[PDB]
From a paper:
Each blade of the homotrimer contains a catalytic domain with a canonical GT-B fold, consisting of an N-terminal acceptor substrate-binding domain (ABD; residues 1 to 68 and 202 to 302) and a C-terminal nucleotide-binding domain (residues 303 to 492).
We used 4RboP-glucose instead of 4RboP, did further refinement, and concluded that our ternary structure represents a complex of TarM(Se)G117R with product UDP and glycosylated 4RboP that carries a glucose residue at the C4 position of RboP2 (4RboP-glucose).
Numbering used by the authors: 1 to 492
Write the structure that this text describes.
């Protein structure tokens, strides 16, 4: 059969759209007898626990398998020996000996060797991990990570205490991977596969080698790169039969610059499209604006898969607007608070429950405290069950200045929730119908946005009516079957 391989850098629990899309794609693919596997390229010792929380939170299917070079090559290295080395362990144990344990807390302890005349070791024992920071002339140079009673990773630092090297040990206690880190360019360098005595100059080469080994060169195998920064690695593979599809998950134009400048990562994908089997966009709007200045004759408008959650009893009894997304400048949080003050000026009972985590938490909280919006606009944090949160909403807002498909708004519409969104490029201009499912407002038009929110917070009847149309809107447009037939077409 046809086996697919989704490409991304990392897969954590507190993520956004791309992640949910890939995992929903995988589930629907696996329901159509098409294998859907995710290929990550990061070191996470707790990857099993993360993926287990993801499948338990109904974010990932059980039949989805995640691939990682830090696991693949670790397993190969575990086949090259038979017993645990315990040599590195014995080294640290003997260095902690002839030294005096000076414990600050019940977790943090120091070690003073009278032969070394100084503190040459620090320890932080937690419930699951034990850290050993080594010191020389009061300067940290090494960090020994112990996870599940086994040395898993070691870090070498410099005089400025910047990472310059990273080492990865296996389950038999043997180093299989060594990495050099440029502390000035904050980048990865010489990657050393000790298990195969190989040498790479970049993580790109190492990950390309991983994909060349994990994925055989067969025509019934296909690589779907959804991450724009993982494209280079997939392009430099020695595959001549494996199909390669790239997916643009966001506006291909510079976030702010309206000069028509394109993002390096996205430009790279859209420029090297003659060397891949095709590029998949979500909106026809993106396809058109990309066809211009690229002349790519391999563009596809296959949209993202959205789980069509079952219907429920929405009474719309709570006056609460919601924005479940990353706290990132992508979403115009400033403009949101500038509209929430207008809403509260009329109805001071309307509450803006914002969900998600990010970097602009402090910024939004400052604007919330600057205004009297402390009891109105409240950040609650990342939600593993957004479905429940949206079920207990009235409307969903969007103040984004750039976006892709817009999963959070589509899910809201599918949960019979009216959506008022800023008309944005390559985004909600394809599913938000002004008057039918919600109100499409001009970008940076606080007045109109607030007036539409007000109408819905005072007419619960119209809210339910608009929401009903929103669910049917998604079902008609983004039918899982329809999207799968478009994917199967590109596959065969
Ligand atoms: O040594 P090498 O191997 O060369 O490694 C290079 C290194 O930079 C790699 O870590 C990097 O290439 C990562 O590769 P990926 O692109 O495959 O990883 C994607 C991953 O990482 C994020 O983007 C990355 C890409 O810029 C950021 O360097 C992360 O710091 C970021 O964390 C995440 O996209 C996914 O792991 C999680 O996806 P999500 O579901 O949480 O987020 C939804 C996604 O659609 C959303 O993040 C995008 O809409 C972001 O929009 P952008 O406009 O592309 O990002 C804003 C800015 O970062 C850039 O525009 C700006 O830096 C450049 O103009
Ligand atoms: O606390 C959060 C915040 C976001 N999301 C998910 O993140 C996605 C948001 O995707 P969208 O396309 O709106 O924005 P992106 O993250 O792609 O920029 C939706 O599927 C949400 O379910 C979530 O589950 N919990
Ligand atoms: Cl042996």
């Amino acid at each position: 059969m046809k086996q697919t391989y989704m490409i991304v850098n990392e897969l954590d629990v507190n993520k956004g759209g791309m992640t949910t899309a890939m995992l929903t794609r995988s589930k629907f693919f696996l329901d159509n007898e098409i294998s859907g596997d995710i290929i990550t390229f990061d070191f996470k010792a707790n990857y099993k626990d993360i993926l287990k929380e993801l499948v338990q939170s109904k974010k990932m299917d059980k039949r989805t398998q995640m691939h990682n070079p830090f696991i693949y090559f670790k397993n190969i290295s575990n086949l090259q020996h038979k017993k645990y080395n315990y040599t590195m362990t014995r080294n640290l144990s003997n260095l902690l000996k002839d030294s005096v344990e000076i414990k600050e807390n019940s977790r943090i302890s120091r070690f003073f060797n009278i032969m070394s005349r100084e503190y040459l070791a620090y320890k932080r024992e937690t419930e699951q991990e034990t850290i050993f920071d080594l010191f020389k002339n009061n300067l940290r140079y090494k960090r020994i990570y112990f996870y599940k009673g086994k040395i898993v990773k070691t870090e070498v630092f410099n005089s400025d205490n910047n990472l310059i090297a990273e080492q990865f040990y296996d389950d038999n206690g043997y180093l299989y991977l060594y990495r050099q880190i440029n502390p000035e360019k904050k980048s990865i360098g010489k990657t050393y596969l000790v298990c195969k005595e190989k040498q790479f100059k970049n993580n790109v080469e190492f990950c390309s080698y991983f994909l060349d080994k994990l994925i055989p060169d067969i025509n019934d195998n296909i690589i779907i790169c959804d991450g724009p920064g993982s494209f280079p690695k997939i392009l430099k593979t020695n595959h001549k039969n494996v199909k390669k599809f790239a997916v643009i998950h966001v506006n291909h134009y510079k976030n702010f610059d309206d000069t028509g400048a394109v993002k390096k990562q996205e430009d790279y994908i859209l420029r090297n499209a003659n060397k891949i089997n095709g590029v998949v966009m979500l909106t026809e709007a993106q396809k058109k604006d990309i066809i211009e200045k690229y002349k790519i004759t391999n563009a596809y408008v296959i949209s993202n898969f959205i789980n069509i959650t079952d219907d429920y009893r929405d009474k719309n009894d709570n006056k609460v607007v919601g924005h479940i997304s990353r706290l990132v400048p992508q979403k115009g949080l400033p403009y949101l608070i500038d509209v929430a003050k207008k809403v509260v000026e009329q109805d001071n009972s309307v509450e803006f429950h914002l969900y998600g985590t990010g970097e602009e938490k402090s910024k939004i909280e400052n604007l919330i405290q600057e205004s009297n919006l402390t009891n109105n606009v409240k950040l609650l944090g990342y939600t593993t069950n957004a479905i429940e949160k949206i079920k207990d909403f009235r409307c969903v807002i969007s103040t984004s200045q750039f976006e892709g498909q817009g999963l959070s708004l589509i899910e809201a519409m599918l949960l019979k929730k009216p959506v008022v969104a800023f008309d944005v490029k390559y985004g909600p201009s394809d599913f938000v119908k002004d008057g039918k499912n919600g109100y499409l407002i001009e970008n940076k038009d606080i007045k109109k946005m607030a007036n539409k929110i007000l109408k819905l917070l005072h007419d619960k009847e119209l809210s339910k009516s608009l929401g009903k149309h929103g669910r049917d809107t998604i079902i008609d447009m983004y039918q899982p079957e329809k999207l799968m037939v478009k994917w199967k077409q590109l596959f065969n």
